[PDB]
Design brief:
This protein is an alpha/beta fold and 273 residues long. It has 2 domains: 203 residues, Alpha/Beta hydrolase fold, catalytic domain (Rossmann fold), CATH 3.40.50.1820; 70 residues, Orthogonal Bundle (Uteroglobin), CATH 1.10.210.20. Strands 1-2-4-3-5-6-7-8 form an 8-stranded mixed sheet, sandwiched between helices. β7, α9 and β8 form a beta-alpha-beta unit. α1 packs across α11, α4 packs antiparallel against α5 and α4 crosses α7. The protein binds 3-hydroxy-2-methylquinolin-4(1H)-one and potassium ion. 3-hydroxy-2-methylquinolin-4(1H)-one binds next to α7. This is 1H-3-hydroxy-4-oxoquinaldine 2,4-dioxygenase. It catalyses: 3-hydroxy-2-methyl-1H-quinolin-4-one + O2 = N-acetylanthranilate + CO + H(+). Belongs to the AB hydrolase superfamily. Keywords: Dioxygenase, Oxidoreductase, Plasmid.
């Protein structure tokens, strides 16, 4: 895109999107998951471009030119993101994550605190601890002999039987340059995050300062999954959710207008106190 930059962040050259829009805060900080980059957000960036400053960091070894890097996890993703924000002179921001980018978002909320990061939106992020199929996928990602098979199994799940042209392009073309260095790492980091924090829901509830967080998701589509979101929301005044009804696990791509209205809602709320 026109908006793509690169800067040195501690030891690493990281790319990032910044539309440099001069306007009222908060900045919208779109956070990628593992082994993809800002390209996942291109449609969402267009929905928001005009009214908001939009920043998208890419993680170590991530970007248009993936590279091998030393092992790191979500704690480092958080430090990386804040340093980029510091370099840009961004104070207040609304973080928005995709899938396991949520580990970065929640830890970012903790580290940045409620004045800098008063709310967050998490998109399509498995709220319960891994079921057998996903646990199996993580096991495959970690295997140097079966990692690609692992990614293919996830692509099947994420597409959910749909010939969704834009999401297919993202998975098959826009993730194609990522190798075992990333996918193995993602398997280890995500597996460790669940192991260490229990679940995304446990981690959020354990925040020192709880804050408005909304989970917007299209998948999984089963009633049992909606129920754990409804139950969590019943218990925690600060949590909400919305089932977006898109075909794939990538609503930022396949229902960008819907993702956008939820983001605008939270940004509008922040602007009113
Ligand atoms: C972009 C992205 N990357 C991942 C890497 C490993 C395991 C799960 C994920 C995931 O769910 C997701 O959406
Ligand atoms: K609630």
């Amino acid at each position: 895109d026109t908006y793509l930059h690169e800067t040195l962040v501690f030891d690493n050259k990281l790319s990032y999107i910044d539309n440099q829009r001069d306007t009222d805060g908060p900045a919208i900080l779109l956070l990628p998951g593992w082994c993809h980059d800002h390209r996942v957000y291109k449609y969402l960036i267009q929905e928001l471009d005009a009214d908001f400053r939009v920043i998208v960091p890419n993680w170590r070894g991530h970007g248009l030119s993936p590279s091998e890097v030393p092992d790191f996890g979500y704690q480092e993703q958080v430090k990386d993101a804040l340093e980029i924000l510091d370099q840009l002179g961004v104070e207040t921001f609304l973080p928005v994550s995709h899938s396991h980018g949520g580990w970065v978002l929640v830890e970012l909320l903790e580290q940045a605190g409620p004045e800098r990061a008063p709310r967050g939106i998490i998109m399509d992020w498995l709220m319960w601890a891994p079921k057998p199929d996903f646990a199996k996928s993580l096991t495959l990602l970690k295997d140097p002999e079966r990692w690609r098979e692992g990614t293919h199994g996830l692509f099947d799940v994420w597409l959910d039987g749909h010939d969704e042209k834009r999401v297919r392009h993202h998975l098959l073309e826009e993730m194609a340059d990522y190798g075992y260095d990333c996918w193995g790492r993602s398997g280890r980091v995500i597996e460790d995050a669940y192991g260490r924090n229990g679940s995304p829901m446990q981690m959020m509830a354990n925040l020192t300062k709880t804050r408005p967080i909304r989970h917007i998701f299209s998948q999984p589509t089963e009633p049992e999954y909606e129920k754990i979101n409804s139950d969590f929301a019943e218990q925690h005044p600060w949590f909400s959710y919305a089932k977006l009804g898109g075909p794939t696990a990538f609503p930022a791509i396949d229902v960008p207008d819907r993702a956008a209205v939820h983001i605008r809602e939270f940004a509008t709320a922040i602007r009113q106190g």
